[PDB]
Structure formats: C-alpha cells, structure tokens
Amino acid sequence: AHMDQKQFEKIRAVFDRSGVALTLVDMSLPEQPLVLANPPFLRMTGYTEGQILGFNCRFLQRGDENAQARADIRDALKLGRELQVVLRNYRANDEPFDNLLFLHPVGGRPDAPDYFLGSQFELGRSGNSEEAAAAGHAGALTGELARIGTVAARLEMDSRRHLAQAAAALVRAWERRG
C-alpha cells in the first residue's frame, strides 16, 4: 500500500512548522529508519538532521536500560496502534534526560501502517507543573495529528482528552518513581 507523494509533502510541511518535537519512521522495513525529524526534535537531542536520517531512533538509548518500555513499543508497532511510554534517553553529548514518547501509526492499513510518528516530551524540565506541560504537549500533538489525517477530525477532541489524560498519568508515575 502507498501514501500519495502529496500527503507525504503535507506531513513535511506539518513537521517543519510544528511547535512540538516530531519524528517519522518508515515501517516498510524491519530496521525502521528515521525519515523525517523536525527542528524541536533536533534541538532537544543535540543532533543535526543530516546526522540522523536513515537511523533507527534507538540511537538515543545506551546499553539496555528500557526493557519493558521497549517490548511495549515493539507490540504497538506490529499491532499498528498508539502508545505512550517514558524512556531514559541521551543527547548527542551523552547528557541524559527522560523522554515521554508518544507513538502514532500513519498511513497504510489498520494493522500495517506505512509509517510511525513519534513525538518526544522531555521530563526535564519545567517545575511543579509537569502534568500541565505534558498535557499541553499532548493537545498540541493531537492538533498536528489531525492536520496529518491520522486522527479523524471529528475525534480530535476525544483523542486529545484521552491523550492529555494518559500523558499526565505517566508524568505522575514518573514522579513517584524517585
């Protein structure tokens, strides 16, 4: 199955002007390479676009440190459905950070998406309002998803509500984790 070149260009434009970190991965092959990565993602990770395209995003990890998170990721990718998970990640300078990662299938068939979209949230970060910030990120993300087409327009409010909820919950878990 194939997405039109015009849709792919729409996704590009969405990425280029987005105010949230966004990545796009090719699901057509098992290596699952990065194919799009926008400035807010580049600036969080300290990389340049030319450095990372063609690589799997696991480059952000070190050793094996996110075992259960990674198994949940693999399932959601094979299934072709959304997932939010928290990961220990590292910038290009090896400084660590915790990544609230949002995953969404793009294109293809219901159980065989053409791409996967990733949006990263840094649990650095703000202060005592991490829940609000994460929920805000999720609302902005849902707006971008709806522009792409992966989230049905009529369901935007419903996705955001649940997405904002799922995000705040994860932030809570992460905060009682030490």
Q: How many residues does the chain have?
A: 178
128 vs 14, 97, 110, 168, CA distance in Å? 31, 17, 39, 12
Q: Does the footprint of ligand FMN cover residue 74 (CB under 6 A)?
A: yes
Q: Does the footprint of a copy of itself cover residue 12 (CB under 8 A)?
A: no
Find the helix or strand (DSSP H, E) in which 37 lies. strand 34-37
Among a copy of itself, ligand FMN, none, residue 136 binds (CB under 5-8 Å by kind): a copy of itself
User: Chain centroid to CA 9: how far?
Assistant: 19
Among ligand FMN, a copy of itself, none, residue 142 binds (CB under 5-8 Å by kind): a copy of itself
Residue 33 CB, nearest approach to ligand FMN (Å):
9
Query: Which one-letter DSSP state was computed for residue 121?
Result: E
Q: Does the footprint of ligand FMN cover residue 146 (CB under 6 A)?
A: no
Binders in 141-160 for a copy of itself, by CB under 8 A: 141-144, 146-147, 153, 156-157, 160
| Partners of 96 in the β-ladder | 90
Q: Yes or no: say if 67 and 88 are a contact pair by the CB < 8 Å rule.
A: no
What is the token pair recorded at 79? Answer: 């299934």
Q: Which of 20, 37, 52, 60 binds ligand FMN (CB under 6 A)?
A: 60
Binding site for a copy of itself (CB under 8 A): 17-20, 40, 126, 129, 131-144, 146-147, 153, 156-157, 160-161, 163-165, 167-168
